[PDB]
Amino acid sequence: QDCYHGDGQSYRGTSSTTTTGKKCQSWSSMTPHRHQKTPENYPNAGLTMNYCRNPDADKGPWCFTTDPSVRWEYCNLKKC
Numbered sequence: 001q002d003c004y005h006g007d008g009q010s011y012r013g014t015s016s017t018t019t020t021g022k023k024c025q026s027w028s029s030m031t032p033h034r035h036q037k038t039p040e041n042y043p044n045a046g047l048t049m050n051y052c053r054n055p056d057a058d059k060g061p062w063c064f065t066t067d068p069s070v071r072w073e074y075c076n077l078k079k080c
């Protein structure tokens with residue numbers, strides 16, 4: 001099962017697609033979106049490849065988007 005539990009900071013699945021069906025930008029890529037959500041900045045977060053994560057304590061997993069126009073979105077993951 002690829003779901004999450006409550007806030008999903010726990011998650012470590014390899015779901016890398018947006019809520020709207022967009023590819024997730026890779027965490028360390030500063031293209032298209034430059035940001036500070038790097039493993040250098042969050043060594044415990046699991047800010048690997050381009051999978052949905054929660055380095056910020058948000059309500060659920062998300063990622064930056066490869067759509068230059070859409071900086072970030074929630075992930076297409078379910079609460080389990």
Ligand SMILES: NCCCCCC(=O)O
Pocket residue numbers: 035036037056058062072
């Ligand atoms: N936690 C949801 C919003 C992500 C904001 C990304 C930021 O620009 O650092």
